[PDB]
Amino acid sequence: PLVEDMQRQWAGLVEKVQAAVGT
């Protein structure tokens, strides 16, 4: 589960950081 782990919890973190596109 290298792909499955980084395709759910990791997608949360990145989605948020773009929304702000700042901090």
Experimental method: NMR
What is the chain's percent helix, strand, coil content, to nearest 5?
70, 0, 30
Give the C-alpha separation, 1 to 17, whole Å.
24
Radius of gyration of the chain (CA): 10
Q: How many CA atoms lie within 13 A of 23 on its CB side?
A: 0
Residue 22, judged by CB atoms within 10 A of its CB (0-12, 13-18, 19+), counts as: exposed
φ, ψ for residue 18 (rounded to 5)?
Answer: -75, -45
Sole residue written with tokens 């773009």: 18
